[PDB]
Symmetry: C3
């Protein structure tokens, strides 16, 4: 009996695991996730970069990163307003790197940017028309997380 | 080995508890929940107050309750139209109480409200400009639920 | 130990099943599902009919099918643009059938439609009028899935 009860419970667990994965898929679909594309989402809350990283990380996601023009637009329509991107030049000034590793490939800088203005700007925000501006990491901007395709 | 399978089941169950919690957090984030703030949700359906209470309760939430101006604005944005609040003077005419207990403190009544008009009005709806009006609990207004910060 | 732990895990599993069901109810509510009404959802992506079917099937739903004028309007409101319906005459030209099975009990064809125009049209799209037009199953239109009341 015990071996049988255990086997039956293992079957229930597998079913429940599939049901939760279905829940995640239906949720992403309902929130706009496109086939074969990363899922971008925001709660429309503005906060310093460190908080955005902690928040996305707590959801098992990462701060949104545009790898190409298409993703840059996708992020732009989700945010609506100025939002941090998962990019910083904290290591070597002028050398922007993804918070998940690697050198910046695609970029969409606004004219005269990046200018590492004032006391310094090592974070990046996507703003009007999807263009980018480097800004202080301590400034508050919209939190946008990304989840894998 | 019976005990080995049992220990794996325990790990499978704890992994699922953690993943469901992550799924709940992501959904709340996607629906606009701000850090440290309770969040509001609606399906935009209009119904009598008793139905709204029953629906929210079943979801382990309560009819939305504005505790201050920020929350009042957040509920107004979510609702988009007249919606019941978790406030009534059903128990003792004239004394509004939160559905979850306690006397009403912060309020945002329209001029000349509440007035327990006619045969009586024991419920409350947030309306235009976000101001409040006491209304019949039998009237149908938008169902808006709140969930804990 | 063994038998007590086993009985506890059965309760842990049932608790998780109840919690997941609640999570699903909350997600549907936030998605706009109305009491006793089936609900339609979209990620706003446009794709060929075969991909819409594969996508909704994977989410355990079906391609949206209006059964009366109310549901037809509801699908029209969710899609916002042209969207495939779960109706085709792929099996026998001229005979439209629900993907779930059977002959139509309701239709809202635009004048002189369906006409299997040009190279052929075996799928159906609800347009920006609520009216229907048969169109190529290979053309890309908005994916709208349906889930039970
Ligand atoms: Ca620097
Ligand atoms: Ca810099
Ligand atoms: Ca700058
Ligand atoms: Ca009274
Ligand atoms: Ca009077
Ligand atoms: Ca009263
Ligand atoms: Ca009144
Ligand atoms: Ca044909
Ligand atoms: Ca045809
Ligand atoms: Ca046609
Ligand atoms: Cl900085
Ligand atoms: Cl009343
Ligand atoms: Cl076709």
């Amino acid at each position: 009996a015990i071996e049988v009860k255990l086997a039956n419970m293992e079957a229930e667990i597998n079913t429940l695991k599939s049901k939760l994965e279905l829940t995640n898929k239906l949720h992403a679909f309902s929130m706009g996730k496109k086939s074969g594309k990363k899922f971008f989402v925001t709660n429309h809350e503005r906060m310093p970069f460190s908080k955005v990283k902690a928040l996305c990380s707590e959801l098992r996601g990462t701060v949104a990163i545009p790898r190409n023009a298409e993703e840059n637009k996708a992020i732009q329509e989700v945010a609506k307003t100025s939002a941090f991107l998962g990019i910083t030049d904290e290591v070597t000034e002028g050398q922007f790197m993804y918070v998940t590793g690697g050198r910046l490939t695609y970029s969409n800088w606004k004219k005269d940017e990046p200018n590492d203005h004032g006391s310094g700007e090592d974070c990046v925000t996507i703003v009007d028309n999807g263009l980018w501006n480097d800004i202080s990491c301590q400034a508050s901007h919209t939190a946008v997380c990304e989840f894998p395709a």
